[PDB]
Amino acid sequence: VKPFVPRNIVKKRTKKFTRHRCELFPQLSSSWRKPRGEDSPVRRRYKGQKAMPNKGYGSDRRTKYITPSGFKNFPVNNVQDLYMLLMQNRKYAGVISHTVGAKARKAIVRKAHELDVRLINGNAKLRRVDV
Amino acid sequence: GVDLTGVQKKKRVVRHHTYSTNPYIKLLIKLYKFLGKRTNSPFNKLIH
Amino acid sequence: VRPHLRHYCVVGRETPSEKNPQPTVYKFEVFAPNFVVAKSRFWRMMREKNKVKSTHGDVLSCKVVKDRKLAARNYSVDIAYYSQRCGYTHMVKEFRDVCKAGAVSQAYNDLASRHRARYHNIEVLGVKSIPNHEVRRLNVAQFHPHNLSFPLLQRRVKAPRKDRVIFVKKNSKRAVVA
Amino acid sequence: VLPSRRSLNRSSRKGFKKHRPDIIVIDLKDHVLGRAAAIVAKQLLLGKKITVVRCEKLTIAGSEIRNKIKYLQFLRKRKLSNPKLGPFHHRSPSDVFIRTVRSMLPRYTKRGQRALRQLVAYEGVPVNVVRTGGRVVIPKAQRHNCYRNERRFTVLGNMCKHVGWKYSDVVEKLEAARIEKSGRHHKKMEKVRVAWKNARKEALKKMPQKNVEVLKKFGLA
Amino acid sequence: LHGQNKNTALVRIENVNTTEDAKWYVGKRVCYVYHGYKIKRCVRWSKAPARRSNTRAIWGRITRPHGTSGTVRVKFNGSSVPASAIGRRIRVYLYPSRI
Amino acid sequence: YSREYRSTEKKLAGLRRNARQHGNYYLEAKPKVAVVTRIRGIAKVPPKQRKILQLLRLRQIFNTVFVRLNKPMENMLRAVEPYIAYGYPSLSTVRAMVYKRGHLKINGQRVKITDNQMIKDKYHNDDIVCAEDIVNQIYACGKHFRTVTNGLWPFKLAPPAGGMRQKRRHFVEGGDYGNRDTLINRFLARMI
Amino acid sequence: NRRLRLRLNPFQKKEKAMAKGMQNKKNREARHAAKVVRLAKARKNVAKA
Amino acid sequence: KVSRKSPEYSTVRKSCKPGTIAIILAGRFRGRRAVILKQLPKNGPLVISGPMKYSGVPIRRIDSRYIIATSTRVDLTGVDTSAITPEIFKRETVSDERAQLQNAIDTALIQAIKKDPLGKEMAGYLHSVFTIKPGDAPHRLKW
RNA sequence: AAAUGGAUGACGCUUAAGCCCCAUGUGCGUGAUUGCCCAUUAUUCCUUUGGUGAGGGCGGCUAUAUGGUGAGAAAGUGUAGCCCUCCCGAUGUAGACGUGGCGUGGGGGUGAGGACGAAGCCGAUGGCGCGAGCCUCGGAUGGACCCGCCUCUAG
Numbered sequence A: 001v002k003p004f005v006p007r008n009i010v011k012k013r014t015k016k017f018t019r020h021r022c023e024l025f026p027q028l029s030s031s032w033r034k035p036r037g038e039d040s041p042v043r044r045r046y047k048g049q050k051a052m053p054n055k056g057y058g059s060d061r062r063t064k065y066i067t068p069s070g071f072k073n074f075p076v077n078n079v080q081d082l083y084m085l086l087m088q089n090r091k092y093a094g095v096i097s098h099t100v101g102a103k104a105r106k107a108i109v110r111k112a113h114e115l116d117v118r119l120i121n122g123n124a125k126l127r128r129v130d131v
Numbered sequence B: 001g002v003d004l005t006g007v008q009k010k011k012r013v014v015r016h017h018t019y020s021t022n023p024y025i026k027l028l029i030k031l032y033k034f035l036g037k038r039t040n041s042p043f044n045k046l047i048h
Numbered sequence C: 001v002r003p004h005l006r007h008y009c010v011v012g013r014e015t016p017s018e019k020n021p022q023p024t025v026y027k028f029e030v031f032a033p034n035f036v037v038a039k040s041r042f043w044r045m046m047r048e049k050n051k052v053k054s055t056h057g058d059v060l061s062c063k064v065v066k067d068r069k070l071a072a073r074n075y076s077v078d079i080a081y082y083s084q085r086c087g088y089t090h091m092v093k094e095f096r097d098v099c100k101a102g103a104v105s106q107a108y109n110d111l112a113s114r115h116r117a118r119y120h121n122i123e124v125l126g127v128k129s130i131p132n133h134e135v136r137r138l139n140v141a142q143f144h145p146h147n148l149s150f151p152l153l154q155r156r157v158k159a160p161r162k163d164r165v166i167f168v169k170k171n172s173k174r175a176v177v178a
Numbered sequence D: 001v002l003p004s005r006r007s008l009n010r011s012s013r014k015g016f017k018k019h020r021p022d023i024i025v026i027d028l029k030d031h032v033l034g035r036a037a038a039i040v041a042k043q044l045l046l047g048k049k050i051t052v053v054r055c056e057k058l059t060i061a062g063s064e065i066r067n068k069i070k071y072l073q074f075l076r077k078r079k080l081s082n083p084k085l086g087p088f089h090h091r092s093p094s095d096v097f098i099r100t101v102r103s104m105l106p107r108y109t110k111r112g113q114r115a116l117r118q119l120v121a122y123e124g125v126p127v128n129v130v131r132t133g134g135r136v137v138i139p140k141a142q143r144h145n146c147y148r149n150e151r152r153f154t155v156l157g158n159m160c161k162h163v164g165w166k167y168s169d170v171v172e173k174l175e176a177a178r179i180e181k182s183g184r185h186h187k188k189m190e191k192v193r194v195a196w197k198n199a200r201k202e203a204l205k206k207m208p209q210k211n212v213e214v215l216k217k218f219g220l221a
Numbered sequence E: 001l002h003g004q005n006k007n008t009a010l011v012r013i014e015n016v017n018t019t020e021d022a023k024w025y026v027g028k029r030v031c032y033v034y035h036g037y038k039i040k041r042c043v044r045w046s047k048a049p050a051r052r053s054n055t056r057a058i059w060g061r062i063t064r065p066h067g068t069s070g071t072v073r074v075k076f077n078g079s080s081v082p083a084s085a086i087g088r089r090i091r092v093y094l095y096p097s098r099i
Numbered sequence F: 001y002s003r004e005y006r007s008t009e010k011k012l013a014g015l016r017r018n019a020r021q022h023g024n025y026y027l028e029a030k031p032k033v034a035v036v037t038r039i040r041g042i043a044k045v046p047p048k049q050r051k052i053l054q055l056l057r058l059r060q061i062f063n064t065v066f067v068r069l070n071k072p073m074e075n076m077l078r079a080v081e082p083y084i085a086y087g088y089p090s091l092s093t094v095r096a097m098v099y100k101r102g103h104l105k106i107n108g109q110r111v112k113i114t115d116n117q118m119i120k121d122k123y124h125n126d127d128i129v130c131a132e133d134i135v136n137q138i139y140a141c142g143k144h145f146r147t148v149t150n151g152l153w154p155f156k157l158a159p160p161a162g163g164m165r166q167k168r169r170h171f172v173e174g175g176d177y178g179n180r181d182t183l184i185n186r187f188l189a190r191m192i
Numbered sequence G: 001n002r003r004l005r006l007r008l009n010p011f012q013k014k015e016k017a018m019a020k021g022m023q024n025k026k027n028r029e030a031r032h033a034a035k036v037v038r039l040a041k042a043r044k045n046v047a048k049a
Numbered sequence H: 001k002v003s004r005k006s007p008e009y010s011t012v013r014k015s016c017k018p019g020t021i022a023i024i025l026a027g028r029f030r031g032r033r034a035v036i037l038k039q040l041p042k043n044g045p046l047v048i049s050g051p052m053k054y055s056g057v058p059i060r061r062i063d064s065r066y067i068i069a070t071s072t073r074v075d076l077t078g079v080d081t082s083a084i085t086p087e088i089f090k091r092e093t094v095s096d097e098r099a100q101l102q103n104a105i106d107t108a109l110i111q112a113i114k115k116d117p118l119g120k121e122m123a124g125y126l127h128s129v130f131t132i133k134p135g136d137a138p139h140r141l142k143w
Numbered sequence I: 001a002a003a004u005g006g007a008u009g010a011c012g013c014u015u016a017a018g019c020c021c022c023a024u025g026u027g028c029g030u031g032a033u034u035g036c037c038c039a040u041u042a043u044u045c046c047u048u049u050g051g052u053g054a055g056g057g058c059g060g061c062u063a064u065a066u067g068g069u070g071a072g073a074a075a076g077u078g079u080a081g082c083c084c085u086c087c088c089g090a091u092g093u094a095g096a097c098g099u100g101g102c103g104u105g106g107g108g109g110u111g112a113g114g115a116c117g118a119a120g121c122c123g124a125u126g127g128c129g130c131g132a133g134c135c136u137c138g139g140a141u142g143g144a145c146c147c148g149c150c151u152c153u154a155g
Ligand SMILES: [Mg+2]
Pocket: A013, A014, A015, A016
């Protein structure tokens, strides 16, 4: 199945927004925190400091949530969940949950190849096998 | 930039949805919103 | 072509009213960069001499005066300038030039260099083309005699902009860099 | 800068004999110090290799006493706590020129340090640069184009001699020998120069006439 | 004075020294030649095996003259030229030709 | 309209020649229309000057409008002189502004002029049905000057291409602000 | 833009044709000569008065 | 009057005409001189063949943006150049019919060159190569 | 005429690189009306977000199997926004308000997962979101429980 691949995908920023001075303290996490300090150089927008996220960095609505392969990810948990993606198989791809066992995965992978439903973490060799 | 001396103090407060949780209120709002847009009736716009 | 301060003639009057019908018409000579400045100087002089302001007056004409042909002449310029320390100073200077506008432009640059007087503190009273044998300045009358000749020394020659170089060989004209 | 054994073996294996990079040799006689340094500094930043000679003949505007006093005021500045860390006051003309050029460079970056390493300065014309080719001048920094004839100027060699330079007599003796040696050789090798000029004049009589007409039209012969 | 912008570069060409001269070179292709430290893929890697080498090139184009003295502005396709090239050689070719 | 412009110009030239031939003078009519542009920013503006600029619709630097130069309007312009530059426009200047930068104010929206039909719809008057009607009403004083000019969004222009002399200081002293008479046309040609 | 100019003003074609005729060489030399004669004749007649 | 769909339609600069002498700016034959023969049917590349015994350039296609067209022109009315066709390049150690075509074209081209009054100088001119010496300024030349 | 050695920012500059004034592309007394450089400014173009926002479509009959082209279309504040055009704003301490905005322990419902390996832990495992965060991969880790969605509750 071939998706409707966008002509070009533009990201306004690839780097992440990290916390101020998170590299100098092992206990500080990298997740973003808004700085509220009366003298903070980041909050005051000095030239050589880190940037703060805001609404202008938003992604284009036409290519939002689209993976590089051109699909959108939808989780699945059993065989019966594959028929939800059967008709719109050019738009959504299935993602098998991490906690699904190997015994149940064999049935899901076998049916998905039969139905022509793309799985992001299925069998690598089967999808290359032509029909 | 622009002046914007008195721009903000001229905005009104307008609501476009109901706070009510009554489903029958929502059905009436749906009917008269349609009639207000598709008819030349000041009465219908007032009801909505 | 070269000089700034073109030669202007401005003609104006006061707006007629029922106290003063048919007012007098005045004619004014001024040296200005453009006609907007020329009209500004006209209304200043009309106000300080006739009590007529630009609000109650009209401008009839404002054109550029044509000068004579190109030749070497003696020009006498009587000029005045103001300073806080001394007040008003009045002098008569002489220059060699080819046109009235050029001589007046020379005087303005000369006053700025020798007395530090700006354009708006200077008033021109007149400019005249005077003959020889009537010049009282030796630095001007030295250009009068026939058979006058002199050499050019301490020249600072420069190549045309298309052929300038940075490094050149010592015993030839061959360029090395640029 | 002296090659090691490793360089000698590698050159011998690959059969390399000699190599000379592209270098411009500038004769700094009767040049204005400040204007020559500014032009040299920019060319170094553009990636040129420059060697200057006769640094003792650079000129500075003003009387010698005025410039001597200027240097003595510079000599007074030193770190009081430990003068061996303080500013260093070099006394030779070539060291003075290098300091002047260094002040017109970004000397605290690797780019600036690399540019300074590309400049070599000498007093007089040393024996290793005499036969390297024709020397050049900078017309925008020459004395006869920069100073009015009535002003008084200072020769850098005479100024440095009275503030600590000790090799003024040595340089003068070496220069006298070079002029004698070069003058003798240039008086020689005149028969070959005359012979070459005569051969060109003998041509235009044996060469084809059509090509002679072309040369005349373009003003070459 | 505030800093530099690395999306545009300035190139000085020999024997130009004039804005009217620099206008002749607008639109010409340029390249910066350097070398790496191991052989990687190149154009005609299979057709012409003699081309394989450590040599690499980064290409760009001349956009407009800069100043009044023959300096030109160059943009290197979609990225910047590395700062290790400051003060090094740049090749200016004669194509595309308008003559 | 083209015939009217040619006839008016050549009639005026004949009158001037008649006076010059006989030694008299001909006095011109005072200008009726001015074109005003803002050349300063929005920082540190006193309340009196702030109000006047709002009434002239010059809320942003390099905005431009057309006004009628009568006594009430002249006294307003004198109060905000160090913030504006103005002069007397020509026919070419008016045509360039309408055709290249003309926008209409329709239903509160700023729409660009693309054809005569939207001009006809916006002005329900019968004397304003095309772009040339807009130009004639502005160049000449016209009966519907206020209707036509108020229906146009204020013009948003680019900075002068060749630069400026001095933002401070009057044009007479060598600066940029104040009245420039017909020399405003050279200023606006680089700006448009 | 040519098609936008004509759309906004359908008289553009004739206005430009007048300008081209103004620029024509033979007509502009005749106009220059005729203007000189007309001005000179009026100057002489006014003086003779 | 020529329509864009018609084969005869082309948009190439007026200096590039049949019989013009050009300098190759890029490729394995950089710096050598050649003669422009014709243009391909559509708005395609030109076909150049400097007399192969003179400059060493065989029949080839080249883009108009990689040659400098000089003002020297040799009359080409005699040479038909009708056999030149896109199919000879379309086909993918030279071949026999390619050699025969090259020989026929070269023979006609050489005769046309010798017909010019400066035939001998033209033959020497085609032998010369173009290079950029230290201190040259191609932007100041006239060509 | 002052207390460490030091400052037109430094070097330096005197046919100035000093002081006062005047000019400008190619061609400065024959080219009238732009010598050149540098912004979070102005013009123009693309994208996001919020509107006192402005318009339009929404009663699905043209015709068509696989091995002329294939997918959607909800009468709608708020989304993975029902969809398509257009216009105007966007910084901000103290402070106010909004969010089908994120995350944690437990209750009522609904739907799944697990010895073919749950929770927990490790990471040059990548992908998605402006972000709080979410998900996949690997473990030459572990050995028994746990989660998605709608609502209720809080140490
Ligand atoms: Mg991201």
